[PDB]
Structure formats: C-alpha cells, structure tokens
Structure 1
Amino acid sequence: DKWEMERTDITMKHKLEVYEGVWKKYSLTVAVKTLKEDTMEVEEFLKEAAVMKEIKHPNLVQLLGVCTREPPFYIITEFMTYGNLLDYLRECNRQEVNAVVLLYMATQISSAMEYLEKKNFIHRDLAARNCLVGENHLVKVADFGLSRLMTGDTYTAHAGAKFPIKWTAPESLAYNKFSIKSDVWAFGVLLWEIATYGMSPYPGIDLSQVYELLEKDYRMERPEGCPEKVYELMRACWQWNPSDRPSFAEIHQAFETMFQESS
C-alpha cells in the first residue's frame, strides 16, 4: 500500500484538528488531518480517504499519504496557502480578484466536477468553504466527503442526517437522495457565493421556510454585477427536476467559452 507511511515522516507546525506540517523526506509543506479516538464517525472518514486514492485532477485536493495502522490517524494532503475560498473572496482586493478572475475560478471548479461526473462520484458538500485557494487564484475542490456510485444513479444518506440547508437540492432535503444532479444544484449556490464575494445564501430567510419557498419556485435574485448568461446558468442549476439541470460537462464547456471570451 504505497499510500501508507509512518507518522515520524511528518513534523507538525501549526494547527489550523487539521495541521500545517512538513513532509521531511521532500521538504514539502503539507496538510495533516488527525483523528484522536476510534469512533465509527472516524472510520467512515478513513474509508473516504481510500476513495481519494483513485482521484487525480489538477483542481482537486491531492492525497499524499495516510497513517491507518494505529491512532492517532493521519490523512496527508497537499497544502493550499490561501485557505478556503469563502474567506478568500470576502477579504480580497476586488480590483485584483475581478470578474475575469471569478470566471476563472468557476471554470476550475466545473472542470473538477466534470471529472467526478465521468468517474461517477458525488461530492455531497459543494460550497465555497470547501474550496481551497492556492497561488495565482488557483482553486481546488476539497474532496474529502466523496462517495462512489457503486450501483445506479442515487446515493441515499442515513435517515436523520443533517445537511447544509441552503446548499442542498430539494430532492436531498425531502428524501435524503443525492446524485450528480444534486451536486449541480449545490454548484449553482457556489456560483452565487462566488458572484457575491462570499455573501450568505438566501440572506435573512428562515431555514425552516427554505424548502417551501423552493417548492413555490422562489430562487435567489441575480447578484449585482453578475452577467446575465451566468445567472441563466445559475437558474438552470436550480431547476426543480434533477433531469432538467445541466451536466457538469455542459457547464464546463459554457465556462470555458465565457472565460476565453474575456480578452
């Protein structure tokens, strides 16, 4: 198992229980995520790390190694120096992180989602807080809660599971069923987060009323300064019927076209 390594190969630097660390064998700064106890919620996290071994895409966080033998367990991934995309957008220089850059970030994210689409994976938590930013506006999707679709189209979460309401497709709120189309819905909210430089979705809306509003065809308004053909994509992601939402292949193509069309 080339992915297994000994904890003495990593030196812990600063807490972020996720740590900034150094893989001393390559002098490479890494992110280390550690698990104290041996609980069943921990074991599901490490079974998701096994899924990370099959994934390799420039815009997905790369797995580097694991410490499965005995606790505390280590998950080692590449380090993104600028942290999560949500805080990044809220604190950035909007003259530097301008509309072209926002377009660039959406193209990167949709490229990774198209990759997961063709390998029949689902993310289940697509949001700005789960995207990591590197140098020169490089964006990578945090792929730690990925699920593999072993048979069929739909994954069903265990009854009683709590989801982020304002990012969750209506099929998942009502029936706890997730698909790549539910990721397309969450991607629409992610677009709205990017276009607003990190505003909270459905501002001021009571969480208990969100689903009923969605049933009655309420959607978020177009953000100020958002191009109309991006808001059209947003609204396409928020179709009621999952089969009426576009694929990530169509979305990446649309964003590649718009991104090249900027000078």
Structure 2
Amino acid sequence: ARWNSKENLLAGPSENDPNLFVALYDFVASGDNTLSITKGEKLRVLGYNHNGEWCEAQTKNGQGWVPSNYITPVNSLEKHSWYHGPVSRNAAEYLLSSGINGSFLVRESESSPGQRSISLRYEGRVYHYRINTASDGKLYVSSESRFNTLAELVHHHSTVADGLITTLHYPAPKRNKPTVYGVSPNYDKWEMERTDITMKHKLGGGQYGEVYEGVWKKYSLTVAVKTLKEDTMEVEEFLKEAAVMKEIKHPNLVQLLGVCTREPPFYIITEFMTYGNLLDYLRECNRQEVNAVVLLYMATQISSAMEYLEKKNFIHRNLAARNCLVGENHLVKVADFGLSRLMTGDTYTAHAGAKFPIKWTAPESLAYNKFSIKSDVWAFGVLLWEIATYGMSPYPGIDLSQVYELLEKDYRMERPEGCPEKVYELMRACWQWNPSDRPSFAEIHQAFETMFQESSISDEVEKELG
C-alpha cells in the first residue's frame, strides 16, 4: 500500500514531452500484433485502428497494438493514481468501502462535466467534498487555501487536513481494467481455431443451455463456450446470437471473444465470469462484506446494462438474478443470450404454448404473450427485490396460480426488511400495471445515482432497522 508517484506531485507540465503516453493498466497480449505493456510504462502512439478502440504503440520492449483506454497522455490528470475520472458518488462509496484511514480519490461528474469532488475514507465512513473553482480558476475545498492545479490541491491536503475530516494519504486502487471488446485491433477478426479450445465441464448444471467452461490454450485463459445442439438445427437462432454479440459493447454485458462458425460444431466464445450467477452469490456471500453499499453498486451496474440495451432497441425477457454474472471486485454483467431486436416503439409476441418464469413476468406477458423493454423493466423490479433480500424466492407464501390474480387487484410484494423506502418505491414504479406507466431504464439508472446524495444508503438502512 504505497503512493509511488507522491514525490512528483508538485512537478511541472514542461518536464515531459507533451506527445508521449503512459500505461494506466497492465495489458497482456491478446493477438499476435498486440503489445504487452505494464502500468506506469511510457509509450509513443503512432495511430489508431478502424474504430479508435485500439492504438499502435512503441515502448522499449517493442511495437504493437494496445487498448486505447488503457493508456493516457503523460500530462493528463488520468495518470494520477488518485484521479478516478467519471465515478459516481455511490460508486465512490464502493471504491472506498474498505481501506485504511486517508484512502481517497478525486472524481468528476459525467453528468455535469468539470465539477469534481474528493471522496475520503475515515473511521469506517466516506466523506464527499465539492472542489470549488474561483473566479480566476483556482481550485479549493477551504476558501482560504486555493491552488492553480488539482495536483497542488491534493498535495496541500496530504500535508494538512485543513477543512477535510482528515488528510489525503493513499490513492484508492482503481476498480479494474476497462473492458476490451474483443482480442484484436483488426476488422472483424472473430473466427478462431476450434482446436485452440479445451472444452471442460458444463456450466450452471445446464440451466444456460450448452455452455461449458473452457480454456483458450494459447493464452492460458479460462473462457465460457456455448455450443449448438446438433439434434435440432436451430442454427439460424444460434448464428443470430453470435452476430448480435459482435455488436454488443458495454462494461456490464458479457463480452464476446470469438466464434467458430466456419463449420460444425458451432461455437460462441466469451469471457469467463469467475463467480457464477448473482443469485447463488447473494445466497452464499458474507453479508458484512457484501453490505448495502455493494448491493446498490451491483443494482446500478445492472441498470446500466439494461439502459444500453434499451437505447440499442433490444429486449431481454429473461432478466433475473440467476441470469446475472459476478466477476472480480463485485463487477456484475447481465447474460446477453436470447436478445431480440425490437424498435422501442413496438412490441414482441412469443409463441403460443411457450412457458414463462411466472414470478418475473409482467401482466401483459402472462396474459397476451407480449413483451417489450417495459416488461424487462417489470422484471428488473423483481430482480431488485432479489438483491434487497439477498436471494430470497419472489412472492413468498403465494402459489403461481394466484400471482396474476393478486397482481390484478394491485397486490405487490412487501418492502424487504431494512430496504430504504426510496428503493422500494422504485420497485413499485417498475411494477406499474400499465407498461407505459413504468419508468425507462435511463430513468432507473439516474434514479440510483441521485438516490443517496446526502447520506449513505448504509445510514438509511440503519434507520429502517433501528
């Protein structure tokens, strides 16, 4: 736990050549023309690939391609271990939910660009401070101590609290490397060699279909692999999923790594989420580690994924805790299998005779087999309840044959124990009988970010209990 570049905090912009870059995270080659780099390493950028997601760089070790958002200009604020860029208040509380006194970070508002804040951990609590800008541009927390640069402001408060609850001692660790959408900087290079993959045991006892844990030998990398059942040539369906996946690009949607569609058996290879589904995780987790701050963190990540699908005109229809996957640092990703393209202004009709997981299905879906992004919203509300109860089964003490009847009389699940009223009201909004009366995912995600801007969800939970 050290602050390496601390003795350089007060160094000038003019001491490094402007056009150079520095590595923000370690990157291990994922393709023959890709280049391995180490955090803190300097590089020279030669150019970008077709979508700007990758760039060709030169380091002392060689020349090659690396993820564009894995590096940053030498004089940018991003090089600082304590500048976490656009991070929300709640996310900040998560990043600082552990660590020694003095752990801190500086965050910006994606919402209101320019506005920055300092989040600090002291005696088990996180404190937030607005960084003000003077009429002449100087930054400050305490009106009597203004500085020209953010680094100088940070340096000052690492020497004396002067307004903060305590001093700035240790930049909080970054969550994790951003997601790389693929393994190659080149144009549509998804196809890979089937022999390069070692198939192992099936995942989730078959509840996800033909999905096996596997190993991409070349990179000593564990991956998930979905294969097509030959006993039923639904090839068109499977192939469609591969195509859709190639287009999906979001931090919280399971990422495609490659495919084997040249000849049978067809494969769809994705990243491996190491901790299984959110439902099992919630039920087996240590509730002291996975407290309210974490639940909110996870619920927020899931809404972000759905907001992305919402604007991309896709519907899910199987949104539930069991269809969410957990990775390192409580990272959650929604399983994007079975996605359907449906223009927001339009609805989908399932095949008569097809069964539905009743407890998560919206009224219009249970009665007319109709689905839309709004029925996904209804499902999210149920999933939110699963999160708030740490995995309980929905509608306790009620038989599936009465669910619809009860819903129709405006009955709804009770507020989970300790669940803050604000969160329960969001659930109720998702469970509005008319789909149009239900909030959009864009509105749901925003609701979470502005839900605890004054106190912490922990204190709220504390009041709901005692």
2: distance between equivalents of 1:74 and 1:109? 26
1:45 to partner: Cα distance: 3.2
Task: Please tell me whether the aligned partners of residues 182 and 242 of structure 1 are also in contact (alpha carbons under 8 angstroms).
Answer: yes
The SS at the match of 1:258 is: coil
Which residue number corresponds to residue 118 of structure 1? 311
Task: Please tell me whether the aligned partners of residues 188 and 237 of structure 1 are also in contact (alpha carbons under 8 angstroms).
Answer: yes
1:133 to partner: Cα distance: 0.1
1:49 to partner: Cα distance: 2.4
Say if 2:339 is the partner of 1:146: yes
1:5 to partner: Cα distance: 2.0
1:136 to partner: Cα distance: 1.0
1:156 to partner: Cα distance: 1.1
1:254 to partner: Cα distance: 1.0
Q: 1:118 to 1:197 in 2, by over 3 A?
A: same
The SS at the match of 2:337 is: coil
Structure with bigger helix share is 1
2: distance between equivalents of 1:234 and 1:102? 15
Write out per-residue CA displacement over residues 5-41 of structure 1, whole angstroms, 9 at most, x where no aligned residue: 2211211243323222121233321101122315144
1: distance between equivalents of 2:393 and 2:235? 29
Q: 1:61 to 1:240 in 2, by over 3 A?
A: same
Q: 1:116 to 1:260 in 2, by over 3 A?
A: farther
Greater shift in the superposed pair: 61-70 or 175-184? 61-70
Which residue number corresponds to residue 196 of structure 2? 9
1:60 to partner: Cα distance: 0.4
Q: 1:238 to 1:22 in 2, by over 3 A?
A: same
Cα RMSD after superposing both structures: 1.7
1:53 to partner: Cα distance: 1.2
The SS at the match of 1:189 is: helix
Q: 1:67 to 1:260 in 2, by over 3 A?
A: farther
Task: Please tell me whether the aligned partners of residues 313 and 344 of structure 2 are also in contact (alpha carbons under 8 angstroms).
Answer: no
Write out per-residue CA displacement over residues 128-152 of structure 1, whole angstroms, 9 at most, x where no aligned residue: 0000000111100000011011584
2: distance between equivalents of 1:133 and 1:258? 24
Greater shift in the superposed pair: 6-15 or 223-232? 6-15
Q: 1:83 to 1:115 in 2, by over 3 A?
A: same
Write out per-residue CA displacement over residues 92-141 of structure 1, whole angstroms, 9 at most, x where no aligned residue: 00000000100000110001111111111101100000000001111000
Task: Please tell me whether the aligned partners of residues 277 and 326 of structure 2 are also in contact (alpha carbons under 8 angstroms).
Answer: yes
2: distance between equivalents of 1:105 and 1:224? 19
1:161 to partner: Cα distance: 1.1
Say if 2:395 is the partner of 1:202: yes
1:260 to partner: Cα distance: 6.0
Identity among equivalent positions (%) equals 100
2: distance between equivalents of 1:45 and 1:262? 47
Task: Please tell me whether the aligned partners of residues 294 and 330 of structure 2 are also in contact (alpha carbons under 8 angstroms).
Answer: yes
Write out per-residue CA displacement over residues 153-202 of structure 1, whole angstroms, 9 at most, x where no aligned residue: 21111111111110001111111111111110000000000001001101
1: distance between equivalents of 2:455 and 2:194? 47
2: distance between equivalents of 1:259 and 1:143? 30
Task: Please tell me whether the aligned partners of residues 223 and 270 of structure 2 are also in contact (alpha carbons under 8 angstroms).
Answer: yes
> Structure 1 length normalisation: TM-score?
0.94
Task: Please tell me whether the aligned partners of residues 51 and 148 of structure 1 are also in contact (alpha carbons under 8 angstroms).
Answer: no
Task: Please tell me whether the aligned partners of residues 320 and 383 of structure 2 are also in contact (alpha carbons under 8 angstroms).
Answer: yes
1:56 to partner: Cα distance: 0.7
Task: Please tell me whether the aligned partners of residues 48 and 144 of structure 1 are also in contact (alpha carbons under 8 angstroms).
Answer: yes
2: distance between equivalents of 1:158 and 1:138? 35
Q: 1:24 to 1:247 in 2, by over 3 A?
A: same
Between Structure 1 and Structure 2, how many residues are aligned?
263
The SS at the match of 2:452 is: helix
Task: Please tell me whether the aligned partners of residues 344 and 373 of structure 2 are also in contact (alpha carbons under 8 angstroms).
Answer: no
Task: Please tell me whether the aligned partners of residues 192 and 234 of structure 1 are also in contact (alpha carbons under 8 angstroms).
Answer: yes
Structure with bigger strand share is 2
2: distance between equivalents of 1:231 and 1:134? 27
Write out per-residue CA displacement over residues 214-256 of structure 1, whole angstroms, 9 at most, x where no aligned residue: 1111100001011100000000000001110001111101112
Task: Please tell me whether the aligned partners of residues 36 and 71 of structure 1 are also in contact (alpha carbons under 8 angstroms).
Answer: no
Task: Please tell me whether the aligned partners of residues 196 and 223 of structure 1 are also in contact (alpha carbons under 8 angstroms).
Answer: yes
Q: 1:242 to 1:54 in 2, by over 3 A?
A: same
Which residue number corresponds to residue 323 of structure 2? 130
1:257 to partner: Cα distance: 2.2
Q: 1:261 to 1:6 in 2, by over 3 A?
A: farther
Q: Whose RCO is larger (CA < 8 A, sep 6+)?
A: 1
Task: Please tell me whether the aligned partners of residues 295 and 387 of structure 2 are also in contact (alpha carbons under 8 angstroms).
Answer: yes
2: distance between equivalents of 1:162 and 1:181? 19
